[PDB]
Design a protein around this ligand. Sequence first.
Ligand SMILES: [Zn+2]
Ligand SMILES: [Zn+2]
Ligand SMILES: [Zn+2]
Length: 85
Amino acid sequence: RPYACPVESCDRRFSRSDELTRHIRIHTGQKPFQCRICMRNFSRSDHLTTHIRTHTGEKPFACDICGRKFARSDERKRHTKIHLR
DNA sequence: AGCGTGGGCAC
DNA sequence: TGTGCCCACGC
Ligand SMILES: [Zn+2]
Ligand SMILES: [Zn+2]
Ligand SMILES: [Zn+2]
């Protein structure tokens, strides 16, 4: 863990430098990815893709047990466990 | 539930 | 560097 966050108040450390560059945006407040539907800005392209699904209703992830659909795989992952008991 | 959003990391 | 998942936490 060689790459430490330069911001004094921040004591985060990272493996690869590209991680520090992404992380540094939490301090600069930079959000280079905009949703052309609601005009909101996001820090990351992947979070914008999933955000947009809230507008379109696209839900590519279906539960293997009941078939319920989700916009994100983690929502599906969190849901699937309700079938156990 | 709905979903923002940082961290780890593959390609 | 850029793109894009998984993973996990938070409200
Ligand atoms: Zn920092
Ligand atoms: Zn939007
Ligand atoms: Zn289910």
